[PDB]
Amino acid sequence: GRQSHKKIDVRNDTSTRYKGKLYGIFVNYMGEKYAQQLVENMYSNYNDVFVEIYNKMHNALRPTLVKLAGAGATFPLWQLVNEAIYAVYLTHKETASFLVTKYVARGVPAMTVKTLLAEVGNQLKELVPAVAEQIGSVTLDHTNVVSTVDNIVTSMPALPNSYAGVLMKTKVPTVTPHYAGTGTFSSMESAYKALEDIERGL
Amino acid sequence: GRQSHKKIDVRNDTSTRYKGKLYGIFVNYMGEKYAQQLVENMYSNYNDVFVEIYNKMHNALRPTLVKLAGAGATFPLWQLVNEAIYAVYLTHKETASFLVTKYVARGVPAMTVKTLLAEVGNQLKELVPAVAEQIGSVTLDHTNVVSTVDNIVTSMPALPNSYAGVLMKTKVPTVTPHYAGTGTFSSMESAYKALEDIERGL
Amino acid sequence: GRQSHKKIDVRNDTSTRYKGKLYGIFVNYMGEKYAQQLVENMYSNYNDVFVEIYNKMHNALRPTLVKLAGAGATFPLWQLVNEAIYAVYLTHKETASFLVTKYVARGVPAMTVKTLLAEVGNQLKELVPAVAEQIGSVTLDHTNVVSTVDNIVTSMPALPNSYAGVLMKTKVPTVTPHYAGTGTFSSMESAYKALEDIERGL
Amino acid sequence: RRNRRLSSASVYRYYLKRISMNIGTTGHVNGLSIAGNPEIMRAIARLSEQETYNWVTDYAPSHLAKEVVKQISGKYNIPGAYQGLLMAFAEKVLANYILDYKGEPLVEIHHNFLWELMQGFIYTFVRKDGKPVTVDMSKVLTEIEDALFKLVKK
Amino acid sequence: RRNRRLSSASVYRYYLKRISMNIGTTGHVNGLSIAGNPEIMRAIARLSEQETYNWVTDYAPSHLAKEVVKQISGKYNIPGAYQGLLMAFAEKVLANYILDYKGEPLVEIHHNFLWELMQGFIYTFVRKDGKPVTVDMSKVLTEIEDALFKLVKK
Amino acid sequence: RRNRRLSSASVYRYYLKRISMNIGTTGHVNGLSIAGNPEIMRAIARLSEQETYNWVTDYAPSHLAKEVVKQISGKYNIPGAYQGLLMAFAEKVLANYILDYKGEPLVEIHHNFLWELMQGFIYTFVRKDGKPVTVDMSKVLTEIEDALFKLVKK
Amino acid sequence: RRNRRLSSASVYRYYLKRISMNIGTTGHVNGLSIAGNPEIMRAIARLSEQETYNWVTDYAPSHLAKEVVKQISGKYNIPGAYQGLLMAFAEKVLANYILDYKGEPLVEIHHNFLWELMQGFIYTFVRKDGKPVTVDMSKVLTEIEDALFKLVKK
DNA sequence: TATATATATATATATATATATATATATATATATATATATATATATATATATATATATATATATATATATATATATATATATATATATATATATATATATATATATATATATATATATATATATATATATATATATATATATATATATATATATATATATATATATATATATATATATATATATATATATATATATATATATATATATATATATATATATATAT
DNA sequence: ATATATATATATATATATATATATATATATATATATATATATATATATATATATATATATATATATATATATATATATATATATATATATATATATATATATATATATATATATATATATATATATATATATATATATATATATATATATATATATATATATATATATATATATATATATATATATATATATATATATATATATATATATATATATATATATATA
């Protein structure tokens, strides 16, 4: 027993693993070039949506998750942050009442949920413009987040998940981390990428 | 339950998916090169008709659809605008009375239908010259849209759908978005395309 | 009988052996370029985790292992240092009581276990900043190590192994051996590498 | 894909398309050689068969839900669009609540789908005779809820 | 991978994917030529077969453990998340202790997984009737422990 | 390589891996052309078969040694690591002494392996019941010595 | 190369290595083009086969010599080293004298190999029982001499 | 140039820090000088494109003939020139081959054993990894499947008529091409048949005996 | 029992030799001749088909239009929802196998030595031969082209003229006009970059110091070869 201790996360190769595996699958559907372009577009979309939103949120919230419920049993918190990003923000499909009811029904203290909702809002507003504009300049807290988010969600009807999928970032261009203003901080990550190819003779 | 949350739209890869899948299917009918040319022509036609008309209309009207009847249950509006672009414009097959009767029979407030018809006219006149000339220089409104559109449609007989299909844009060339005048604004989209191939060594 | 006497260690070719064999396997999954990038990333990760932590620990500890229980049957000591590096440090999953109990159950003198915990902590605090900050500036000894480590593990709940896997070194940069301060000593090893390629006409 | 009433043709379509996907899966690159061997071919055939059988066995509840929604809509003279929408609602409510009971009370989902259907909830429809009729969404929503609980004998 | 109840589908999936891995393994570079030869093809087929057979034969105990954890959780109205977590716990305890007995007392693992479940161990759960209930983590942990020894007849 | 109990899977693994090695061996540079030829392919297949058969036939003695070591360890409640170590010891004493008899007396190898096991030779083990037990290394070593001679009927 | 008892494995090994050497031989530089053509491939295969057949047919005498030397050493309890040395001696003496009869009398080779073995000709060996024994080199040399003459019935 | 040590002198290097002079870099903004990019309209300067025709210049293409310079071709014969083939022997040169032995070099092989190299295998814990599997949910992406409708695209289908391109069918005759069929005889290539004898090859069959090989039958011991 | 060995011996037939001889048939020669074909000429004539024209119609089908509609499936959207998979991330946990560690052994191969032999080839030399092809000489004819000449004639091509005429593109004017670029202005902006400042602070260098120390090579001595 106790064979190994696997770890699941974005390891700077999930890109290539995804690309290569789906390429190998789809060659028997498309032929070489068509499958190539297909997997290229597929991964680009998956990146700019899932990575840019969910992975940044998970990386930001991991430490506070450990602070609150330090455990391997933080999986329900992951459920909560996922639904919050999808079901509440960007869709206005459910109010804070629903999440708090559900997760206290699942055994989560309420104020924990309120705090998590507060922080995910405070960061998603930095990631996505439209959500920041809908919430305005209101710092969220486990004292005020519920009323504010409930107002925002009830003000809007159920939004089509087409907003949540691609269009939201598609319509609006944003500052790059290769810019002035507040876009002058992150390329360190991308920087390594460059170095890599130069070392590989690429 | 609640396995996933799918999203359906044009995702900058529908070209490749369409081409590749139909190529794979048809190679067993034509052989390689003939199937290649066939899927090329098929997608080109599908592009220049469906994309250029319907997808632009959908992207334009999605915001107003949400503002008016914000819901996942906006489908009746979608079939409304589809029939509008097909049945009334480019064919003069039905008068506004037919659509308003049908969709109030389906439970839609009439003035909403009137507003939508006004807007689809206001944009289709920008996209298609012939309709712009048929309607002339008349801004449509839920107060005057039905009158003008009924005047036009009764004035013209039932047109053969050969107009609505391909020939309409085939006969008349338009200003490119790669031109001076009012064709100097959008190629940003196409621009990305170029960059893409350069990055792929293409 | 007595065919040979194999020796297993990091022989300045495990990089190449790993890369080559896995490349050979994966070409039949990916194709040349994708499999190449795959093995590159995979070995980079395996290096910067396993080598940097476990191999340096083993190289430091080997002489003391021989001094204490000099034998080919230091095998349980290697199991112990593995458990210590993974289960206790970087995870706080178990307290020293568990390890000492288990290994005296396996027939290991307890003070030997305490000694090894002391040294592995004293070295890991140099290797990983986070552990050094968790333990602070306290020298471990078989007289005091158990109390301090049990204090630390009781203080922190079980952490997700995502810390122990990649993120730990990923988030924080460290002083290189290509620096001033305490990073101006080790280029010797790297130097050899460089020399090699120059002699190979590379 | 356009609307097609479920029938054996659909079963066979799913079967063959899964055959294609599986032969794509196994020989990640060497699809041709794997395609030439009849043995792995038999294996892939049986796999696709098992997969279709799985997918069928896990669909009858949704069929029943769509059926009862159709009955109710026909009884209340509702255009096809909203019939499909209520089919989706019924499947959702049976899945998340009746079967697995995700952590949410019924009325909560009810109000969620209510906000979904707003624009507000009493819609007027013109029958084939010209007689306009009106129906409340929330009422018929709650109606199929009880109707659903009747089916599974909850 | 998403949740899928174990069935023959999984068996065949593992079978075929192991075919892919083995054909990759043998022809380290000459994958094509080895893929073309039917003899090594039969060899790889039978190898993947034996491999799947091994993996199945050494998985039934885990299946029984997950089954009993499912029964207990269903009896105690516990949400799916903790059902899976307790399945994993029972797996761990049967593996390291019941079968091989790595040198650690059961109560030690008990307190370890207890700290694993803290936040602190009497969680409140809202059933489908709206009646809130509470369960002690340590107690039910000790509970399935005894049940576990009952199965293997320890 | 991680520990895996001997089974047919290992036979097939050795088979295919030697196939790869031999196709590498013959066409020292022209590996592809040799890979295309079916005749030399059959030759390599039969060669790898013979090689696996050889390796199997000359391994059963070590298997029996590991078996009796396992039995003794189980009877004395010894941790797995030491079980493997004593397996290796029994293999040594059968090979170098019982089979070919290199020029060395038994008790010499005995004391050699004793210094191997020192730290010193009476180890304390905590059973699953908590009852600690002690065993002399030299004794159990000498114990399996005769037990080995019992097997081979020396 | 390490000692490997003769078996069919050796036959096939020599076979394939001769394949490599011959494909190297024919296409002195254009090895690739020759490697692509199946006709010269068949020719090379059959050539290597014939060559292995030759090498086999011209080795059984040495095998018998090594066999009888092994039997004699077993009867006189000699360590493997000297067993191989006397095998080589028997091979030499049968080749140069028994078969081709180069111009040399037997006792000449005898004394030659005697000076080969000195240090001086009565070596002491300690058996597995602890009973030391001594054997005269010249005697056992002469002993296997006649024994060889018995095999071929010379 | 080496061999021991010691200098100066300067080439780097690495030690710790400090300057100076720079080369970049990122930090925020400001300049200037440029390199591009737009965003709208004007230049002159090519760059093509037209759209009209007209030039000169040359690239080809014809149409008729004539040259010249060549490229082949055939007609007949004659040279040199070298290629390579046979007909006669002789050389050197080296390609293998064989005949006896002796080398060195190396390819394996076996005989003992000893290293090291990594190839796998079996005995217990850590990696990245994917093989997955589950077991719990959540994503995006996708393959499908519904459920209502709407498109465009093409797959057929039917409805009515019209084309075009074919596939056959018929209705008259006329071709060429061919498959046969006759009707006369003549060839050639065969397939058999006969009439005479002779072969070689092999199918059996005898007539005597001798083998091996194996098919079964007749005296006691094992699987 | 059936079948396999360990000796002795039949009969029986399966073949094979060891000689002589049949008859029979399998081919093959050797001549003469049939007869039946398989084709092929040689003329004449059918008949039947395979095509092809030569006109006029069909029906049938293959496509394509020309309008209208289906139903069906191929895709694509439009929205809600499933189900099944392809992956991915979340956390926990097994088993399996694929590579790497961390020790102890195997066996197995890939090598490398450590001695002694083989055997087999790869070459090399040591004499004597071959045959074989590689060339070269020493006397003669073939195609064979490789050229050249020596006349005549083609056809074909390369060009060049000698007229007329196209078409085509190479440029150039003549006029008008596009569109696309190349640079230039004309204003307002960007972004990007080249530098230069304007302060700060790094990082990497190029040097220069400021003490210590290496190794390295540039020289110079201080004895020696």
Token pair in block for residue B65: 């659809």
Per CB-CB distance under 8 Å, the chain E contacts of C103 are 103
Is G21 near strand H, with its CB below 7 A from some atom of it?
yes
Is B105 near strand H, with its CB below 7 A from some atom of it?
no
E-contacting residues in F 28-47 (Cβ below 8 Å): 31-32, 35-36, 38, 41-42, 45
Residue of E79, E76, E96 whose CA lies nearest to E141: E76
Q: Which residue type occupies D120?
A: G
Which residue reads 């890599």 in tokens? Answer: A196
Alpha-carbon distance E7 to nearest alpha carbon in chain A (angstroms)? 23
Q: Quick check: E25 and C158 CB within 8 A? A: no
| Facing B16 at nearest CB: one of A34, A156, A164 | A34
Å separating the CA of residue A42 from the C1' of nucleotide H142? 10
How far is F81 from F73, CA to CA, in rounded Å? 10
Rg (CA), chain G: 21
Please tell me whether residue A10 adopts helix, strand or coil conformation. coil
Per CB-CB distance under 8 Å, the chain D contacts of C27 are 29
Please tell me whether residue G134 adopts helix, strand or coil conformation. strand
Pairing status of strand G132-136 against strand G122-126: antiparallel
Residues 41-60 of B with CB under 7 A from strand H: 41-42, 45-46, 49-50, 54
- Chain A / chain E CB contacts < 8 angstroms: 47
Q: Can you name the residues that pair with F134 across neighbouring β-strands?
A: F124
What separation in angstroms does the CA of E130 have from each of B86, D103, D107, F77? Answer: 53, 10, 12, 53
Is E139 near strand H, with its CB below 7 A from some atom of it?
no
Å separating the CA of residue G45 from the C1' of nucleotide H203? 39
Per CB-CB distance under 8 Å, the chain G contacts of F46 are 12
Q: Does the CB of D94 have a partner CB in chain E at under 8 Å?
A: no
Q: Does the CB of C17 have a partner CB in chain E at under 8 Å?
A: no
Judged by 3 or more CB pairs under 8 A, whether B touches A is yes
Q: Which nucleotide is nearest to D99 (CA to C1')?
A: I82
Which residue reads 């906000």 in tokens? Answer: D115
Chain I nucleotides covered by protein, CB below 7 Å: 66-69, 72-113, 115-123, 179-180, 192, 204
Per CB-CB distance under 8 Å, the chain D contacts of E16 are 22, 25-26, 40, 43-44, 47
How far is A36 from C31, CA to CA, in rounded Å? 11
| Facing E24 at nearest CB: one of C29, C105, C157 | C29
Is F91 near strand I, with its CB below 7 A from some atom of it?
yes
CB-facing half-sphere around the CA of C36: CA atoms within 13 A:
8
Instruction: Write the DSSP string, E80-141.
Output: HHHHHHHHHHHHHHIIIIIIS--S--HHHHHHHHHHHH----EEEEE-TTS-EEEEEHHHHH
Alpha-carbon distance A68 to nearest alpha carbon in chain D (angstroms)? 22
CB E56 within 8 A of CB F13: no
Å separating the CA of residue C126 from the C1' of nucleotide I151? 106
Residues near G104 by beta carbon (within 8 Å), at least 6 away in sequence = G96, G97
Q: Which nucleotide is nearest to E21 (CA to C1')?
A: H131
Q: Does the CB of F53 have a partner CB in chain E at under 8 Å?
A: no
Task: Region of C155 please: left (phi>0), alpha (psi -120 to 50) or beta.
Answer: alpha
Experimental method: cryo-EM
Judged by 3 or more CB pairs under 8 A, whether D touches B is yes
Å separating the CA of residue G111 from the C1' of nucleotide H12? 68
Q: Quick check: E116 and C158 CB within 8 A? A: yes
Residue of B74, A86, E86, B5 whose CA lies nearest to D96: B5
CB E99 within 8 A of CB E75: no
Residues near D19 by beta carbon (within 8 Å), at least 6 away in sequence = D44, D45, D48
CB G12 within 8 A of CB F46: yes
| Facing B72 at nearest CB: one of A40, A160, A165 | A160
Contacting chains of A (3 CB pairs or more, <8 Å) are B, C, D, E
Residues near C30 by beta carbon (within 8 Å), at least 6 away in sequence = A20, A21, A23, A24, C38, D28, D29
Token pair in block for residue A55: 């992975």
Is E1 near strand I, with its CB below 7 A from some atom of it?
yes
Token pair in block for residue A8: 């699941």
A-contacting residues in C 55-114 (Cβ below 8 Å): 86
CB A77 within 8 A of CB A69: yes
Phi first, then psi: what are they for E112, rounded to 5°?
Answer: -60, -55
Per CB-CB distance under 8 Å, the chain F contacts of C1 are 92, 94-96, 99-100, 102
Residues near D18 by beta carbon (within 8 Å), at least 6 away in sequence = D48, D51, D52
| Facing C76 at nearest CB: one of F81, F94, F96 | F81
| Facing A1 at nearest CB: one of E82, E95, E126 | E95
CB G68 within 8 A of CB G147: yes
Token pair in block for residue B95: 């008068």
Q: Does the CB of D98 have a partner CB in chain E at under 8 Å?
A: no
| Facing E100 at nearest CB: one of A1, A70, A72 | A1
Judged by 3 or more CB pairs under 8 A, whether B touches C is no
Q: Does the CB of E138 have a partner CB in chain F at under 8 Å?
A: no
- Residues before each break in chain B (C–N > 2.5 Å)? none
Contacting chains of C (3 CB pairs or more, <8 Å) are A, D, E, F
Q: Does the CB of D33 have a partner CB in chain A at under 8 Å?
A: no
Is A160 near strand I, with its CB below 7 A from some atom of it?
yes
Is B74 near strand I, with its CB below 7 A from some atom of it?
yes
Which residue reads 């709206």 in tokens? Answer: E130
Phi first, then psi: what are they for D136, rounded to 5°?
Answer: -85, 130
What separation in angstroms does the CA of F18 have from each of A16, D58, F8, F36? Answer: 31, 46, 15, 18
Is B18 near strand H, with its CB below 7 A from some atom of it?
no
How far is C112 from C69, CA to CA, in rounded Å? 9
Run of H or E residues at D57: helix D38-57
CB C26 within 8 A of CB C39: yes
Mutation target among A34, A82, A134, A155 for the B interface, most CBs of B within 10 A: A34
Q: Quick check: F126 and C109 CB within 8 A? A: no
How far is D123 from B76, CA to CA, in rounded Å? 13
Is E110 near strand H, with its CB below 7 A from some atom of it?
no
Q: Quick check: D103 and A25 CB within 8 A? A: no
Resolution number, Å: 4.0
Number of other CB atoms surrounding residue B92 within 10 Å: 19
CB F94 within 8 A of CB C49: no
What separation in angstroms does the CA of E134 have from each of A70, A107, E73? Answer: 21, 9, 13
Number of other CB atoms surrounding residue B150 within 10 Å: 15
Token pair in block for residue D81: 């669009």
Q: Which nucleotide is nearest to B58 (CA to C1')?
A: I78
How far is G115 from G111, CA to CA, in rounded Å? 6
Instruction: Write the DSSP string, chain C.
Output: --------S--S-HHHHHHHHHHHHHHHHH-HHHHHHHHHHHHHHHIIIIIIIIIHHHHHHHHHHHHHH-SSTTHHHHHHHHHIIIIITTT--S-HHHHHHHHHHTT--HHHHHHHHHHHHHHHHHH-HHHHHHH-S----TTTHHHHHHHHHHHS-PPPTHIIIIIHHHHS----TTSSTT-SSTHHHHHHHHHHHHHTT-
Rg (CA), chain C: 20
Q: Does the CB of F89 have a partner CB in chain C at under 8 Å?
A: no
Q: SS in 3 state form for A114-137?
A: HHHHHHHHHHHHHHCHHHHHHHCC
Q: Quick check: A31 and B20 CB within 8 A? A: yes
Cβ neighbourhood burial of G146 (10 Å; 0-12, 13-18, 19+): exposed
Helix, strand, coil shares of chain G, percent, nearest 5, are 70, 5, 25
Rg (CA), chain B: 20
Rg (CA), chain E: 21
Is A179 near strand I, with its CB below 7 A from some atom of it?
yes
